[PDB]
Design a protein around this ligand. Structure first.
Ligand SMILES: O=c1ccn([C@@H]2O[C@H](COP(=O)(O)OP(=O)(O)OP(=O)(O)O)[C@@H](O)[C@H]2O)c(=O)[nH]1
Ligand SMILES: O=c1ccn([C@@H]2O[C@H](COP(=O)(O)O)[C@@H](O)[C@H]2O)c(=O)[nH]1
Ligand SMILES: [Mg+2]
Length: 306
């Protein structure tokens, strides 16, 4: 490629943490907002980091931390066919999602101030200078998937999250499963899986910045999922980032062309990566990979002259 091995390696680095305790302080301040609100006293819930910070795939220190505030004493379920809540001894919920969200908003408002809480479509932004909290908060309910492994046992399920965007469309994710699977792949690749994620994100940004290629449907989450689908041998068998990226692009192109991409899941394994309601298409990813291939000049220009 046109980039040195030193340059590529720099672009694999985790984003610097200019706070040392940013994740810690952020989780702790949000937890404090909830725990001191008496209206949560009888509720069970978890405050945890998801997205790029939860996966250690963040490439910019300035980016916002995604914090899930997940209710678990009331939850949603996916059952095997023909089963209902009463087959598992459950009610339809002692609190609705909107009631829970409004409690969360009150707690966050009391902690951070009404002018520093903004409700977006899929998250609540906290911009608190006083407590140094810059975070996207996702209030969710735990989602108990009993169907995936066909569990009739109330305590055996795959754990996800579910919430309703501000337009009331349903969103189901499996952030903890995603995190666990990404840790596993990192362990199997000598920590090079997440390094590869980070350098491909930085190269996407560089292609946009330098007017080579721009496609708003190529999200960071998509890039992480694409790289998670690269077989470990393409990461473990090479001695340079140049060659690792080269083989990654060859593999993704081949997999779109031979339709095997249709079996790829997101990192959680719980949804397919490509389908008709994703923001991206296979054409988008083909274009992205082709553009990266050209940007990196894996086909060297004539006489090494651009
Ligand atoms: O489970 C998910 C999570 C996220 N997304 C989609 O990914 C987009 C970002 O959602 P996230 O903010 O959770 O992803 P991320 O931290 O890894 O990436 P960045 O913040 O750096 O962008 C969102 O706009 C959503 O479209 C999913 O499709 N499924
Ligand atoms: O499936 C999704 C989509 C979005 N989000 C949250 O909503 C924000 C907006 O992401 P997009 O844009 O949908 C994300 O950064 C994240 O905090 C989720 O939790 N799950
Ligand atoms: Mg994010």
């Amino acid at each position: 490629s046109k980039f040195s091995e030193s340059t590529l390696s720099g672009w694999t680095k985790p984003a610097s943490v200019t706070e040392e305790d940013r994740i810690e302080n952020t989780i702790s301040m949000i937890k404090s907002a909830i725990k001191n609100d008496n209206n949560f006293d009888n509720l069970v819930y978890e405050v945890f980091v998801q997205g790029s910070y939860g996966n250690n795939t963040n490439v910019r220190t300035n980016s916002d931390i995604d914090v899930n505030i997940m209710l678990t004493s009331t939850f949603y379920s996916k059952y095997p066919e023909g089963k209902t809540n009463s087959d598992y001894g459950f009610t339809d919920g002692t609190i609705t999602y909107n009631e829970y969200k409004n409690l969360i908003l009150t707690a966050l408002t009391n902690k951070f101030g009404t002018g520093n809480v903004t409700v977006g479509n899929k998250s609540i932004k906290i911009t608190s200078n006083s407590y140094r909290v810059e975070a996207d908060c996702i209030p969710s309910l735990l989602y108990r998937n009993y169907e995936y492994e066909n569990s009739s046992s109330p305590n055996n399920y795959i754990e996800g999250i579910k919430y309703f965007a501000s337009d009331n469309t349903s969103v189901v994710n499996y952030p903890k499963v995603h995190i666990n699977n990404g840790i596993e792949k990192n362990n199997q690749t000598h920590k090079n899986y997440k390094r590869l994620v980070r350098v491909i994100k930085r190269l996407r940004n560089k292609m946009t910045a330098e007017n080579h290629f721009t496609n708003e449907n190529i999200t960071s989450f998509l890039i992480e999922c694409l790289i998670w689908n690269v077989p470990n041998n393409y990461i473990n068998d090479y001695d340079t980032w140049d060659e690792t990226i080269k083989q990654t692009l060859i593999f993704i192109k081949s997999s779109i062309n031979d339709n095997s991409y249709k079996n790829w899941t997101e990192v959680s394994g719980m949804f397919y990566l490509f389908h008709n309601n994703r923001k991206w298409t296979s054409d988008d990813v083909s274009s992205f990979v082709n553009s990266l291939w050209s940007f990196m000049e894996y086909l060297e220009h004539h006489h090494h002259h651009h």
